[PDB]
Amino acid sequence: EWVRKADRAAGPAAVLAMATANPSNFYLQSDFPDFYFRVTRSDHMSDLKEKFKRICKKTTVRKRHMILTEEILNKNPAIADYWSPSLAARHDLALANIPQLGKEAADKAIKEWGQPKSKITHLVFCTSAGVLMPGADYQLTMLLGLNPSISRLMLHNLGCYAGGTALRVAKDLAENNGGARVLVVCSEANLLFFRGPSETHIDALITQSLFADGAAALIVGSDPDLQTESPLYELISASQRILPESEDAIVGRLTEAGLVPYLPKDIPKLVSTNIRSILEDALAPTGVQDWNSIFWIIHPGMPAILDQTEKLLQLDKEKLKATRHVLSEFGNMFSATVLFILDQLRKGAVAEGKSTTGEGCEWGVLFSFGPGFTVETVLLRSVAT
Amino acid sequence: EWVRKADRAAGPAAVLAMATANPSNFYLQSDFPDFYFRVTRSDHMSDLKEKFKRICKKTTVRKRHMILTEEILNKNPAIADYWSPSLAARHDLALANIPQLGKEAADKAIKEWGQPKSKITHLVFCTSAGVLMPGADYQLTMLLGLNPSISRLMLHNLGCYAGGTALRVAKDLAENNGGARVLVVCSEANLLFFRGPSETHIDALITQSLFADGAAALIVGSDPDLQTESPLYELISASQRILPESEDAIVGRLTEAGLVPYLPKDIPKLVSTNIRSILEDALAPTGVQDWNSIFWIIHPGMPAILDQTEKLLQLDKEKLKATRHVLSEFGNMFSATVLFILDQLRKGAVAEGKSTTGEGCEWGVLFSFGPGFTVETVLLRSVAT
């Protein structure tokens, strides 16, 4: 069967531009334990400091960018406390930083896109760094001077899987509206999760070794004008799933002291048990049987999950090179991380001179996860270079 | 031009079922000032009590349903304080009430729909009553036993306009996915806004006279099976807009004591200045020139806006009957209110025996507003009864 266009778009949603941004301030992971235990004014609990240095090394993280400097923490000592009333102070930092960080990435993505920002018709904006009313989707619309009649979707506090959510949402917006151009911005920071240490709570300590700050911006649209627009990826399918027997695996309670995490269940084992059937469900319409003929983007929120997935599917240990690079160079930037990885993978494909934006492969899978236990899966199709 | 279906849907998104729910506990507005100033243990500030009784009368509200009973407030005295650390306690109440309230409305809407809940493929869930990780979208999916692979969109703290946002989102989900059935649930409560009085802050006092609790649930899908499904409305267009010169008109800061509002600009004057051009922009593809030949749903967050819009467009004073009924009987239930009004309008059209679900008219406009200053506009088309 066939129907007229009317107002809808013909082809699948395509990623037409991507860019990233980070706060200028960064910390090297080798220096972080000394800095962390100093500024949280917690040098005495030396056994925990030794635990943190062991934890920090096995993250395989090299540096992380952070809004929170020593001076800012000194002007907001409640943030450095393990648990003190500090939500308003964190949200004042989110208001001064999160939309601005999203604008730095968006400006670069619009620069690569090359079209007037007046053609942007939708904005999807995700952050777990601060609940603002009006949201950072509004603040960005004002800072960027986007059209006042843009269709916005503000996604607060979905957690680490919201990178895939943002693509899943943009896919339906672009494909159902002719001429629609969707600005996608995940702007993330540890502003709600940062806190001092306590031997009573080690879940919080592990999160202090990984979470970092950064923004990723994308332009998504269907039916590209192939003269002025150059697609990088095609969004072919996008799905969400709650894993069986995963109740309360990842829980973040928003309190007077910010976001406090809770992680009872063994997350690597949940992913390992379910990863294969999810992936071959996503690959079902492609005709791919060898898992090494596709490109890969896995949310590196737990580095062990990269290792066990690599060995379980017997991946070529260069398949996750882009994923491990972003992890090492930036840490876990919440929902932005998998879009950082999509960008690094694109740049490395161009750099090393492969035939496709997907490192020489045609098909690729993007896989992120978070509270639920929730998995977002996106099937991507590369573009010849 | 024409394209094949593939996986997309043919026709416009239609509302196929709606239902509402409220907490059992309610307060009559005539009794509220005495109850409010007693339980906030603020009887001494008698001048403010007289202000509150004047404010409460001109709301035209008769009763409001509230999770917060006298006993619950007594077990959480920080909530009754004007400004005390109480976010965790409010969020514990949201976890015990908001998904459950959404399930009461959803069950009724699924009952009217008549199809197996296994055919629900998407869930859109809006609330400003509590930021939960995982969200109330997840909790509802578990309580309802919906498919683990449902595509969810959790919308936290958009404010009062999220009723139109939820329809705008559901429209693209239903129209771009063949066979998709979208459960839409706005479950709202004053859990983050309730607090005691302070003569220093009268914006907070006015909000205490209007905000109330309730949930609305809808089934939205394109291409109805006209044997087993009966459309109630068609979602023809859905747009969002930031009003000019409205910076910081409605602001809600999420603090250690919950949500505190701030309302400097004159909201009735912003709406009055812009209402007509927005409405005739929405009506542009219909061919309607007389504003009394369409049915009406206006978010009654400020009752004065109903009066000034009525007189500005010289409406028949029965056009807003459904809108004023929900206001009087339930108060301002945040994003759920305009869906309550859509339901009341449908029921009254059937009751009084009109020819269309839109009170005998063909076209109708749904109009809600919130932080931005943001306006959501939905063009609806009724169905013969």
Numbering used by the authors:
A (entry chain A), B (entry chain A): 7 to 391
From the paper:
In this work, we demonstrated that PECs in agarwood are biosynthesized from a common precursor featuring a C6–C5–C6 skeleton produced by a diarylpentanoid-producing polyketide synthase, hereafter named 2-(2-phenylethyl)chromone precursor synthase (PECPS). The last remaining candidate gene encodes a PKS (PECPS) sharing high amino acid sequence identity with the other four PKSs, as well as the highest 93% similarity with AsCHS1, and this gene maintains the Cys-His-Asn catalytic triad conserved in all known type III PKSs. The crystal structure of PECPS showed typical homodimeric type III PKS folding. Crystal structure analyses suggested that PECPS utilizes unique one-pot catalytic machinery that includes the release of a diketide-CoA intermediate, which has never been reported in other known type III PKSs.
